[PDB]
Amino acid sequence: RCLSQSRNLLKTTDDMVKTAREKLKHYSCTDIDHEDITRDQTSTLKTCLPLELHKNESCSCLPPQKTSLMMTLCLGSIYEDLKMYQTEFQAINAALQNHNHQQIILDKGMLVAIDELMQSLNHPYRVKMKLCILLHAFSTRVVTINRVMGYLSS
């Protein structure tokens, strides 16, 4: 299922976050400075909710037992949101190796994990600052994905 992949990706993200916290003691990795990049499309915060938690209609891996017409919007939003995430981690991964700076290595854990999720579901100095703020928002995001997927699957 997608579920084992979800736990694997959550665990490797936790490991990468703890390594970043250890290594980047003075970098902007604490304060939080939480500025998301998903302001353009926000249906993850809008469509990824339970049907018993739905009170007003104004605002594969899918099991046949839990079939809904509005969960597809949530899965499509997660799909596109993670494609934009994947595209920018390609950029930061390429940018973290061109210079001689090699104190921090980003293993392919989230990369291969989100790649497997995508194939399963359908079908200087500024750079590490950007990487840390993206991981800070990405932790809360990936908690949201795991929450909604664990809800929809079970």
Binding site: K25, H26, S28, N100, Q102, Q103, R126
Partner: protein, 570 residues
């Protein structure tokens, strides 16, 4: 971007040479300013209209990577700064080939580290339009001290002299080296030969054949072969052995280490590394030595006399190899009779009628057969006293050595041609040699007997005497056990004093007797020691007067203390 709190700029460049100066400006978007400086992300350095545009000068940048950040405490922005040097011109180029099947490998010295990402290029050029190029990236973790180009040119064409180049590129300044010339012959090191195996020929450990497989065009080979006896390893050369060699004149029954190296040409190629060591065992060789056999003549009866046979093999020229079987065989000289037996131990006994002479032979049967049958003629234990020499003498100047010197027999010294000496264990001595040096299987502080037989075909002479190597004063003396009076003579009888208290050979006894009321010197009698005696006589003393008796045991190097006391009133 991420620096929404303003901007920072540096002058002149993000990359800087050592010891230069930098001008840093921190600015903020319209509507205190501190600078934090780091080394390897390590904090060792620390520091509204004016804050809108702050200009500062930073110098004395240490060698490495530095983090300089402008922070208002909310951070404003920052730049990462790297300092370094241009690479040094590399020195001591050295390129290596490995055998017929091996690409070009080579090594060079990159000198000191610039703490910056650099890359190195290796260039190979040579006649008949041969060239190659490769790159290696060097950083704080990876060092390009050696590289393999991955191209294996033909070693047959050894008539081209080639050029090697190495070049260094960094962000600061390019570096190069001299275009080193090299001779194709020098680069190649042939691989050591394999299939180095042993074949046994001629049924002897002194002979063998070595076989191996190696490049057929190799013209020179060298072999090291050594046992554990000496650290020096035996050297031998060979010109066009073609994978096979024959080894003659080897010392048998010995573990050997064998190694081999190659050389393709006398003026071309190079040596080879040592091959795998062969741990070989050398087979046995049948000995040709002659072993003496010793006999004792003890007379049970005139028709069933007992004859013993003793021998000892103590050298690996007559006891070489796994000896297990001893085929003993006796012949009778006067009448045609022989006896044969198999023995595994060194002592063997047999009952034979006393009449006639004998010839006793033994074999040394090892793994591949027996040695030559060693035989000794047997005569009477003692012959006439005409051939008996003068009393033999013995001297020990050393605690573990005895020299025995014999006078020639009173008749002549020409009839006998060999002397045998025993103490039992046996040695041989020619008559020409004046004395005999024996220093083995003897322990001081024990009385010994030494015997020499002059071996003759008709009647062999015999002589013997008792002595010891080293002796000291005896620990104690014997006791006066029994006293008797008869025929106006006093007989004193004792017991055999035990061995450990004499510590050697006892020479004589001195008995002191006196009257009980005399404090003067007691009168003394001298007794020469002999094994057979156990009682001693003494003349009549003064009647009706008590007498005190005691004794001491005196050797050459000491005297036993006074033993017991006896009071007698006759």
């Amino acid at each position: 971007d991420v620096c929404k709190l303003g901007t920072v700029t540096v002058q002149p460049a993000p990359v800087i040479p050592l010891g230069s100066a930098a001008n840093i400006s921190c600015s903020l978007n319209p509507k205190e300013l501190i600078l934090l400086k780091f080394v390897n992300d390590v904090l060792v350095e620390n520091l509204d209209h004016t804050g809108h545009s702050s200009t500062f000068q930073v110098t004395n940048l240490s060698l490495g990577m530095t983090l300089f950040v402008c922070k208002l405490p909310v951070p404003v922005c920052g730049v990462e700064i790297s300092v370094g040097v241009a690479p040094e011109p590399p020195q001591n180029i050295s390129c290596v080939q490995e055998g017929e099947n091996g690409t070009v490998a080579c090594s060079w010295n990159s000198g000191k580290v610039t703490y910056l990402k650099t890359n190195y290029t290796l260039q190979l050029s040579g006649p008949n339009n041969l060239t190659c190029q490769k790159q290696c990236f060097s950083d704080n973790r990876q060092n390009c001290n050696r590289l393999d180009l991955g191209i294996n040119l033909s070693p047959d064409l050894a008539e081209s002299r080639f050029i090697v180049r190495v070049t260094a590129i960094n962000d600061l300044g390019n570096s190069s080296s001299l275009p080193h010339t090299f001779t194709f012959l020098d680069i190649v090191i042939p691989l050591p030969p394999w299939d180095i195996r042993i074949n046994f020929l001629n049924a002897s450990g002194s002979r063998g054949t070595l076989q191996w497989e190696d490049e057929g065009q190799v013209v020179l080979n060298q072999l090291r072969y050594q046992p554990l006896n000496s650290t020096s390893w035996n050297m031998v050369n060979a010109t066009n052995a073609k994978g096979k060699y024959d080894l003659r004149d080897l010392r048998p029954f010995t573990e050997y280490e064998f190694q081999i190296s190659s050389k393709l040409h006398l003026s071309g190629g190079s040596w080879s590394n040592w091959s795998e060591s062969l741990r070989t065992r050398t087979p046995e060789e049948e000995p040709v030595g002659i072993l003496d056999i010793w006999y004792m003549k003890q007379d049970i009866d005139y028709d069933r006399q007992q004859i013993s046979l003793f021998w000892k093999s103590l050298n690996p020229s007559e006891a070489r190899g796994k000896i297990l079987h001893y085929q003993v065989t006796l012949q009778e000289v006067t009448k045609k009779t022989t006896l044969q037996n198999t023995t595994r131990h060194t002592s063997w006994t047999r009952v034979i009628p006393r009449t006639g002479a004998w010839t006793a032979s033994v074999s040394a049967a090892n793994s591949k057969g027996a040695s030559a049958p060693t035989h000794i003629n047997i005569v009477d234990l003692c012959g006439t006293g005409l051939l008996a020499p003068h009393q033999v003498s013995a001297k020990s100047e050393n605690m573990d050595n005895i020299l025995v010197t014999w006078q020639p027999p009173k008749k002549a010294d020409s009839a006998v041609r060999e002397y045998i000496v025993e103490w039992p264990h046996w040695l041989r001595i020619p008559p020409d040699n004046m004395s005999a040096l024996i220093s083995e299987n003897i322990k001081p502080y024990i009385c010994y007997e030494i015997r020499v037989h002059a071996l003759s075909e008709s009647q062999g002479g015999c002589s013997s005497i008792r002595g010891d190597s080293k002796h000291k004063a005896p620990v104690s003396g014997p006791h006066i056990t029994a006293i008797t009076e008869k025929k106006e003579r006093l007989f004193i009888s004792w017991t055999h004093i035990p061995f450990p208290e004499q510590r050697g050979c006892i020479l004589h006894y001195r008995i002191y007797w006196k009257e009980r009321d005399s404090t003067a010197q007691p009168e003394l009698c001298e007794i020469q020691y002999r094994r057979s005696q156990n009682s001693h006589p003494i003349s009549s003393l003064q009647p009706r007067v008590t007498y005190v008796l005691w004794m001491t045991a005196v050797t050459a190097a000491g005297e036993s203390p006074q033993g017991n006391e006896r009071e007698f009133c006759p």
